[PDB]
Short mmCIF file of C-alpha atoms in Angstrom, two decimals:
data_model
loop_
_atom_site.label_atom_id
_atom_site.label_comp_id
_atom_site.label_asym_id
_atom_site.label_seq_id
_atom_site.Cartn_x
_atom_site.Cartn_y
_atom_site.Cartn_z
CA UNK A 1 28.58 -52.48 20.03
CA UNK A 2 28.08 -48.91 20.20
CA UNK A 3 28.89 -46.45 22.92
CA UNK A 4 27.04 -43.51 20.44
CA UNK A 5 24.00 -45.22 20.08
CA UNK A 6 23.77 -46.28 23.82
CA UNK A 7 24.75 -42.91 24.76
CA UNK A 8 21.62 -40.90 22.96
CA UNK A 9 18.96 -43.44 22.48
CA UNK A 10 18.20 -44.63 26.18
CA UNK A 11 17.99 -41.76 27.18
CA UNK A 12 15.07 -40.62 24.51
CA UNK A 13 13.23 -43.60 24.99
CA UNK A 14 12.09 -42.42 28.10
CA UNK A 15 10.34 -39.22 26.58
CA UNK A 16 8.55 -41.29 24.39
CA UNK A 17 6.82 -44.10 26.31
CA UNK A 18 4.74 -41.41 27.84
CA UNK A 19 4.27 -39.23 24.86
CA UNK A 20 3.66 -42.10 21.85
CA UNK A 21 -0.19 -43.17 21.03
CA UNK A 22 0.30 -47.20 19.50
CA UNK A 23 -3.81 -46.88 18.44
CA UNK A 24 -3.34 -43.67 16.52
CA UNK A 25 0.05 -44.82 14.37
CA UNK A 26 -0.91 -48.20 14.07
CA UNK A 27 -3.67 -47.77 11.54
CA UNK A 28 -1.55 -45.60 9.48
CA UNK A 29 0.91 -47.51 9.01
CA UNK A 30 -0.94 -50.84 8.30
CA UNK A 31 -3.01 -48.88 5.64
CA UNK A 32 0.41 -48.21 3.65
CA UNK A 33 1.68 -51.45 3.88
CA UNK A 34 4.72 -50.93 6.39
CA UNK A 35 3.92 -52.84 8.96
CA UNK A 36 4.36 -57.16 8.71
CA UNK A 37 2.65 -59.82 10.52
CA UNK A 38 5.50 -61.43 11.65
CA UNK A 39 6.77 -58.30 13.28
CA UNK A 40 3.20 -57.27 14.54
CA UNK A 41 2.92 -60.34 16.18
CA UNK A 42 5.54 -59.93 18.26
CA UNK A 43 4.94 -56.21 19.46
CA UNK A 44 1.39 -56.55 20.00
CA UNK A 45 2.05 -59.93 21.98
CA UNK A 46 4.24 -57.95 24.68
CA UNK A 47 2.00 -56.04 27.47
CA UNK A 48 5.58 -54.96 28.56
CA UNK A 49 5.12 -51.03 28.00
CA UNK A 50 9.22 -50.54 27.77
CA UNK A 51 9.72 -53.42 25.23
CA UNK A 52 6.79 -51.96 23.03
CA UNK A 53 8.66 -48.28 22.80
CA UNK A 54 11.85 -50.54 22.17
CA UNK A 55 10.24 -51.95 19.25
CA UNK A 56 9.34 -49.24 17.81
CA UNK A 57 12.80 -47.87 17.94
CA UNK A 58 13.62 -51.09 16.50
CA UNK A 59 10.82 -50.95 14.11
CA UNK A 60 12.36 -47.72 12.28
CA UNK A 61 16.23 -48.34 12.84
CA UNK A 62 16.35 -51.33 10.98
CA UNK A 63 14.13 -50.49 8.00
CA UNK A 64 15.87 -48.57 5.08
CA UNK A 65 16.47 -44.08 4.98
CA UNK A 66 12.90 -44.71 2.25
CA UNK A 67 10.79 -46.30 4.57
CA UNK A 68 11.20 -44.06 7.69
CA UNK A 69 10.32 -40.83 4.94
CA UNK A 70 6.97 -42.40 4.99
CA UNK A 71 6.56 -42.46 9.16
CA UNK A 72 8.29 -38.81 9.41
CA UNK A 73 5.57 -37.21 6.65
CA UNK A 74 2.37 -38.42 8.54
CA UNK A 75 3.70 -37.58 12.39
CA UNK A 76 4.47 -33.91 11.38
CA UNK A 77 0.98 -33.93 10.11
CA UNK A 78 -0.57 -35.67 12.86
CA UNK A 79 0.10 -33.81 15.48
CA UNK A 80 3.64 -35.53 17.02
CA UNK A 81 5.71 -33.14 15.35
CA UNK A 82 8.56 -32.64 18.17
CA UNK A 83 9.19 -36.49 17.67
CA UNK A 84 9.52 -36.47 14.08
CA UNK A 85 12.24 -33.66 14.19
CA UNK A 86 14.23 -35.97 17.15
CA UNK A 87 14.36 -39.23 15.04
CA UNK A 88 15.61 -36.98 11.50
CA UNK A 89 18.25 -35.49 13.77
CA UNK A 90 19.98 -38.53 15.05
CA UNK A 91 19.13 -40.49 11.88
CA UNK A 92 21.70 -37.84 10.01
CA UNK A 93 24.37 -38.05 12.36
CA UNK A 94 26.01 -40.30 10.87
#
């Protein structure tokens, strides 16, 4: 459990259901490799629009600091910019 993480990251999540593209990141991120079948499976499965923002929350929270590096350098470029500077924020909080 914790109070921190429930504190900051429901409270996001709602900003970016309406303001995250799934078509446009998905092919990136296939193309490089950092997506799995296993997991794809699962998100692509769900037609539930606040379980598919949850796993992508999920998708870069339990992946390792190197992985995420890749994710943050191609949304600055693409265009979502204001959401790569609030998940490198709260990733170095501690």
């Amino acid at each position: 459990m914790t109070p921190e993480q429930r504190e900051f990251l429901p409270e996001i999540l709602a900003e970016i259901i309406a303001n995250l593209d799934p078509t446009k990141i998905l092919e990136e991120l296939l193309r490089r490799g950092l997506l799995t079948p296993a997991e794809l499976q699962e998100v692509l499965d769900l037609k539930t629009p606040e379980e598919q923002a949850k796993k992508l929350i999920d998708f870069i929270l339990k992946l390792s600091p190197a992985d995420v590096q890749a994710r943050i350098n191609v949304l600055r470029a693409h265009g979502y910019q204001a959401l790569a500077d609030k998940l490198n924020k709260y990733l170095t909080l501690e």
